[model samples]
Target: GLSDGEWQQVLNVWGKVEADIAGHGQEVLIRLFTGHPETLEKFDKFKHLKTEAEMKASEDLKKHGTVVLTALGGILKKKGHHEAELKPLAQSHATKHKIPIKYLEFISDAIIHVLHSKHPGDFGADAQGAMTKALELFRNDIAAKYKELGFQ
Candidate 1:
């Protein structure tokens, strides 16, 4: 659990970054696919995008990116009040999409990297730690179904 101070720190940093959701989302997707090529196969629309250029030109990329950013933004905004909100998403990703837990962890790392890069001076260790913990909490809930299905 995060202290109220940590929550404020997370909200502040996230508010700034969320202002440029499209860019942040795109960077995360790019980093994920580039760093772990196998992750591309998780999305049929993106699987054929063999290069960064191809991915950059994809409309689905933007759409999906927005979705990713929006979901994370909601979680950040709602904090503890979002558990019920996240259940469906968690179930879909874990049971339906069958996305491996590792990809989610990788994307969490990518999000932190992008956040640090985008907010260089404004972001600090406290903000990063809070965000990392937030992502870790999100991953635990989202990946629970994967574990239940023995895919962990």
Candidate 2:
């Protein structure tokens, strides 16, 4: 769902985030939980952490953060088509986890925020726009499957 040029822009910034993927992942998680406290309840392991300090110290949060970005990175590296490659994940998050579609949108926003926060100068306007559109398509890809499985 992304043009080749947009994909190129995405890959350009993504490369900067890859080496320290887990580190960036943690920030995105922190941003998500902070911006949308209701989202914390979606993860049992993190539901108890009632404060920013608690979130910062949780090993589970750290690990899950890596998971979030790594999954996105995987799809991004493949240039954003995910009808088959990501069905199981989409199903699990939809029917299995009972996660609402809004939470995924929130995560996408968190990712973009963290990306910019981490590399403000390097990840400038061009890449940010491309990344946003690419993730929009990524979210749509998952949403379609969520629809197909009747999770809505």
Candidate 3:
């Protein structure tokens, strides 16, 4: 849960970055794939893309990134009602995709990286904390769903 001030900070930062949602979302995927190349194997569609330029030109990558950013927007829109909003996404990722917790954590880091990169000095610690907490909540829910489905 975020404090009132922290929530406000998140909205402020998100407002600035959200305009370029497609670009920022794509950057997050590219950053994650660059930092942890092995993780790219998890994406059946993206596994073959070896460069940032390749990914940027890929419609599949664009759609995938858009999906993430769209969901993120939903989470931001419904601040206090996160669990309900995030659970379906978590469940889908856990059961359908069999995405590992590590991947989720990596994506979280990638998202933070993009937020910081976009905002530079504008994104304060409060906004970072709020995003961290939100990602943790999503990670926990996804991991729990994975375990519930008898996946290791």
Candidate 4:
């Protein structure tokens, strides 16, 4: 979905992210929740986290965060060519869970922020822009799936 140069840009930073899926993944969700607490309410395992400290310490939260990051890593490995991989997630979120796609936009923003904070020099203009487009590509595909399933 990305140009060769853009794909390279994404891969360069993704290496850093994929190295510690649990810790960074937890950071992503934590940033997401800190910005939008309502999204936290969507997760049964994490809904009860009353404070940021609670979220930071919850084993269940960390486990789910790692799982989600792991899933993203698998898809990223394919450069997002594997459309089939995202359908189940779309079906679950759009159909069963009724989670709106807007939350994904928020998470994407959180991801960018996390990357910028973690590697300010590496995640500069070029890499940040590439990651933005990359996430948008995936987000658009997932949104399409939501539409196809009559949930959007």
- Give per-residue lDDT, candidate 3, residue 71: 83
Ranking by lDDT: 4, 2, 1, 3
Residue-wise lDDT of candidate 1 within 1-152, one digit each (tens)? Answer: 87888889889988886788887888889999999998888888888898899988887897788899988889878775777877888777777787788889999999988887887877888888998888888888777656666774
Give Cα-based local distance difference scores for all models.
0.83, 0.85, 0.79, 0.86
TM-score of 3: 0.87
> Which pairs in model 2 have colliding backbones?
none
lDDT of 2 at 74: 88
Worst lDDT run of 10 residues, candidate 1, spans 143-152
Model 3, residue 7: displacement in angstroms?
Answer: 1.9
The candidate with the higher TM-score, 2 or 3, is 2
Clashing pairs in 1: none
| Per-residue accuracy of model 2 over 32-76 as CA lDDT, tens digit each | 889998888878888899989988888888898888788878888
Pairwise lDDT winner, candidates 1 and 3: 1
Candidate 3: segments with Cα more than 4 A from true spot: none
RMSD in order of candidates: 1.5, 1.2, 1.9, 1.1
Identify the candidate with maximal lDDT. 4
* lDDT score for candidate 1 against the true structure: 0.83
After aligning candidate 1 to the native by TM-score, how far in Å is the CA of 70 from where it should be? 0.2
Whole-model lDDT, candidate 4?
A: 0.86
lDDT of 1 at 9: 84
Worst 10 residues of 3 by lDDT: 1-10
